[PDB]
Design a protein around this ligand. Sequence first.
Ligand SMILES: [K+]
Ligand SMILES: [K+]
Ligand SMILES: [Mg+2]
Ligand SMILES: [Mg+2]
Ligand SMILES: [Mg+2]
Ligand SMILES: [Mg+2]
Ligand SMILES: [Mg+2]
Ligand SMILES: [Mg+2]
Ligand SMILES: [Mg+2]
Ligand SMILES: [Mg+2]
Ligand SMILES: [Mg+2]
Ligand SMILES: [Mg+2]
Ligand SMILES: [Mg+2]
Ligand SMILES: [Mg+2]
Ligand SMILES: [Mg+2]
Ligand SMILES: [Mg+2]
Ligand SMILES: [Mg+2]
Ligand SMILES: [Mg+2]
Ligand SMILES: [Mg+2]
Ligand SMILES: [Mg+2]
Ligand SMILES: [Mg+2]
Ligand SMILES: [Mg+2]
Ligand SMILES: [Mg+2]
Ligand SMILES: [Zn+2]
Lengths: 116, 136, 177, 60, 50, 75
Amino acid sequence: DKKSARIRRATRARRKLQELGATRLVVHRTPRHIYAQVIAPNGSEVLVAASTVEKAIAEQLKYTGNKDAAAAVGKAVAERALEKGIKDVSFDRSGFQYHGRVQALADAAREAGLQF
Amino acid sequence: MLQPKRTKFRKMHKGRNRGLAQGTDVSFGSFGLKAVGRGRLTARQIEAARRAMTRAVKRQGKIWIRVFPDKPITEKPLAVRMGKGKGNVEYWVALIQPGKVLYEMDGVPEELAREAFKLAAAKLPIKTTFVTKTVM
Amino acid sequence: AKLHDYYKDEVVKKLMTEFNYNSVMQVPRVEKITLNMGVGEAIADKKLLDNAAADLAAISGQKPLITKARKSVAGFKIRQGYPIGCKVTLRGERMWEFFERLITIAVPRIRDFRGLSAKSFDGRGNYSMGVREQIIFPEIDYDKVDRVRGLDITITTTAKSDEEGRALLAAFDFPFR
Amino acid sequence: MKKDIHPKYEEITASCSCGNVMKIRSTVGHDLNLDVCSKCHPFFTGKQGRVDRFNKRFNI
Amino acid sequence: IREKIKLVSSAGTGHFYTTTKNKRTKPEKLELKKFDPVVRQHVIYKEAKI
Amino acid sequence: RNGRDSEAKRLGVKRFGGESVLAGSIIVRQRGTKFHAGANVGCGRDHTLFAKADGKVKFEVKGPKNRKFISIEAE
RNA sequence: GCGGGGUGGAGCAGCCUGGUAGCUCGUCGGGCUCAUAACCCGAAGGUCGUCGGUUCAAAUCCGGCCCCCGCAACCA
RNA sequence: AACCCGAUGCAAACUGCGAAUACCGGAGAAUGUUAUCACGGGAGACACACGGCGGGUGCUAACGUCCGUC
RNA sequence: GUAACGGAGGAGCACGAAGGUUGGCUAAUCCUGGUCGGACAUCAGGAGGUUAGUGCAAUGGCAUAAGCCAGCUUGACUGCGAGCGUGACGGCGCGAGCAGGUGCGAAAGCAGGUCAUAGUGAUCCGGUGGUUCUGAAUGGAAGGGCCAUCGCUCAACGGAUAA
RNA sequence: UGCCUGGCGGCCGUAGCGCGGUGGUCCCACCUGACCCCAUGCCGAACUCAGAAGUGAAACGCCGUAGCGCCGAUGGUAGUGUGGGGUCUCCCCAUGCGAGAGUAGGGAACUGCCAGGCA
Ligand SMILES: [K+]
Ligand SMILES: [K+]
Ligand SMILES: [Mg+2]
Ligand SMILES: [Mg+2]
Ligand SMILES: [Mg+2]
Ligand SMILES: [Mg+2]
Ligand SMILES: [Mg+2]
Ligand SMILES: [Mg+2]
Ligand SMILES: [Mg+2]
Ligand SMILES: [Mg+2]
Ligand SMILES: [Mg+2]
Ligand SMILES: [Mg+2]
Ligand SMILES: [Mg+2]
Ligand SMILES: [Mg+2]
Ligand SMILES: [Mg+2]
Ligand SMILES: [Mg+2]
Ligand SMILES: [Mg+2]
Ligand SMILES: [Mg+2]
Ligand SMILES: [Mg+2]
Ligand SMILES: [Mg+2]
Ligand SMILES: [Mg+2]
Ligand SMILES: [Mg+2]
Ligand SMILES: [Mg+2]
Ligand SMILES: [Zn+2]
């Protein structure tokens, strides 16, 4: 079970962030799509979200499951966060390696102005 | 003479023997011999009683022993003073509480069972009573 | 390649009909082939394990992974972490090429070949066989062979049962007595 | 596959007595001549008492 | 079996740390970058006799 | 052959539920994490749980394993 | 009570410091002799008191259980 | 006869359960010659005994012995 | 917290990685198939679920693993320390956080040795290195102080004497 | 507003298993390739990337189903604080507290935020 393995991999960092009380930028990656959510320290409320499943992001992208799409989502989530005034967040790779698409999303979010 | 084949520990605290027994019902046979008194049953006593009832039934029917002597009893040799460590294990006992079914019998008539249990009871240090299986 | 092409072109159709599979995904697939050599003599001489590895490399076309004792065993006079075997895992193109080479060339070259047992399935549709001599593989050179080394070949399949496993191998015309 | 750790593996021509020719990747490098193959091997092809003996030898 | 050794600052302050070493198993001299409080910098410290 | 024992280590709960504590105060001494650190509680090298903020001690059972956690509710 | 033992048929090693049973004699086969002994050549024979425990592994280390030695077993 | 399954017991150094009490903390009332705490002057004492309750040891022997608590 | 010549076992170390961090990983045992290969080696699959593991006793812990593997490393840092635990005392222990400087990580972070609890010895005397201290008329020096560190199976282990 | 799916939580078995059925528009999964980025103590298995021909087979989700796990009274029983009593190695009485097991029974979770598809 790849998912269960990934969740195990994600748990240590997620528990740490919860203990720190940090606002968390959670990323989910699938072969076809990438998702970014900014979740409140409680972990039960999503402040802002952006994904390749959203039409506005999807329409401008050739493919939703590549690094270019990842960068688009990173920029989108960050811009929405900045309007909300979040500014400072902690990146939750959610058991995925900090590399490739996940890394492209993060770099875009940093470029956009989210601090992490 | 019943004895544990092995034990985690050689010696055991004296302890106490309060409370009523578990296993108060005839569970394997038609008839049983139940303890009405509290006490210790030594392995030798259990064997003596077993031999008496077995001979009375003349190797007919089946006998269950519901008690097992798993408690080691130590004694100090004669002319030893107090102290210098706990004594050596001399024999094994089962702790008996009132209500404990000691033995059970099946495949014999009730009158024969009553006679056999009377012979066995004469070997035991505790007062006993004849019991029969019940529906509930 | 060729056997992979054959699998898709012919084997799938034959198996689909035979088992009345609802989906193509139901049809058994050859997941991987693992070649293992158990070099017990390695404990005496390290070079023997190296030579065995070189033989496995030549047959596989792939650098072998050295295996080491999971636990110490007095009987075999082995301590945990001591290298006592080598293995190669073949997947995809390399697997299909090896599978072809084995059936087409190596298996015929087996001495006194009378077919392979069809009872060598593990109960889960996976087939294991042993090669007594590395000579059968053309890559190995008889003249340069220092010692006769055997190997054990396992074919891991997605087949749920042995019947599906034997059918899959039969479709490729794997020799069976 | 990792680079520089594996044996050289190239397509080679394998020829048999039956005349079957197969081009396969191998570490052998040189072209191979084979005595037997799956096509011509007896098992694959399928090419693979006393009372009778008595009567034949001692027919009267 | 383990013997006490000094780790002496390369800064020439004369500041030293002390630790133990298994000399038979590990003959090679221990060298570590450690804080030298005299210079207030991390510098190389090298093993010496206690 | 017997006759030996070690000194008692004075482990156990030092501050019970509802007790007001200053930051730094030891709440429980233990071997291993019989109790786990919750909010505003730290875990020392010997698994001592101590207050990281002033407040009231709170014992709670939480998570899939139903583990006991000690937290400090800020005053 | 405290120590030391128990290993081819006999007497002794090996234990300490686990893996890796020796020596002398005796026994057996062949030889020398008229024959026996002596002598010469070749060979076999303890899985280590008896269980358990530890160990990947026990003659070896630990703990009984048995046996056999030594010392102690006292002061009113 | 392993294992496994059904039925039956046993445990100071067993626990997939679990009290009463005790203890720690908080609040409130009444009662109590502050009964509390700190600091300073002066000590004595550090052979305890029996009885009840919970135990180790001993033979659930001792006007025995060793702890806990009254 | 708690005694007995009560019941049972251990320690007088080890480790420059077996420490730090980042990334990853998950056990025992059994069954089936498989060259040599056997009760037991390595390989494949299944069951099982920690019945494994933890440098070393036992107990409590441990999957977010504290277990296992790899990369880079020296936080096995120096000065301090709110607050607290445990002691008749000498002492011993836990500790956020602050300053300086550092390692790992993209980052959040984590790191003041090791899953925790044994692995130890006061004072005196003396040794070694350092030092904005002292320096018996004065300048030095000697000697002393201060800081770092070394020498006791002082094991009858709060150590009567060097004997 | 409902239905369906994904992500993050609460909660931590009345929530987990087993067994049977069911789903691919989207989503998800498997999947298709790999010169790449990146990876294998060997292996594109995994990790990773570039994709979308195929299939819901597996996985996963959903629905149904007590073979189980799990939950679980009432009453009684055991124990026990205080006071009292006896035939005192153990009990009894008054009063207060009151299990464990077992029984009847329950039970195939519930729920918040955000996003997407559909009606
Ligand atoms: K008393
Ligand atoms: K002394
Ligand atoms: Mg004592
Ligand atoms: Mg203790
Ligand atoms: Mg004590
Ligand atoms: Mg108990
Ligand atoms: Mg109160
Ligand atoms: Mg005194
Ligand atoms: Mg006194
Ligand atoms: Mg007293
Ligand atoms: Mg008493
Ligand atoms: Mg008495
Ligand atoms: Mg007295
Ligand atoms: Mg006292
Ligand atoms: Mg006392
Ligand atoms: Mg202070
Ligand atoms: Mg002097
Ligand atoms: Mg002067
Ligand atoms: Mg002068
Ligand atoms: Mg000086
Ligand atoms: Mg003393
Ligand atoms: Mg009730
Ligand atoms: Mg109940
Ligand atoms: Zn041919």
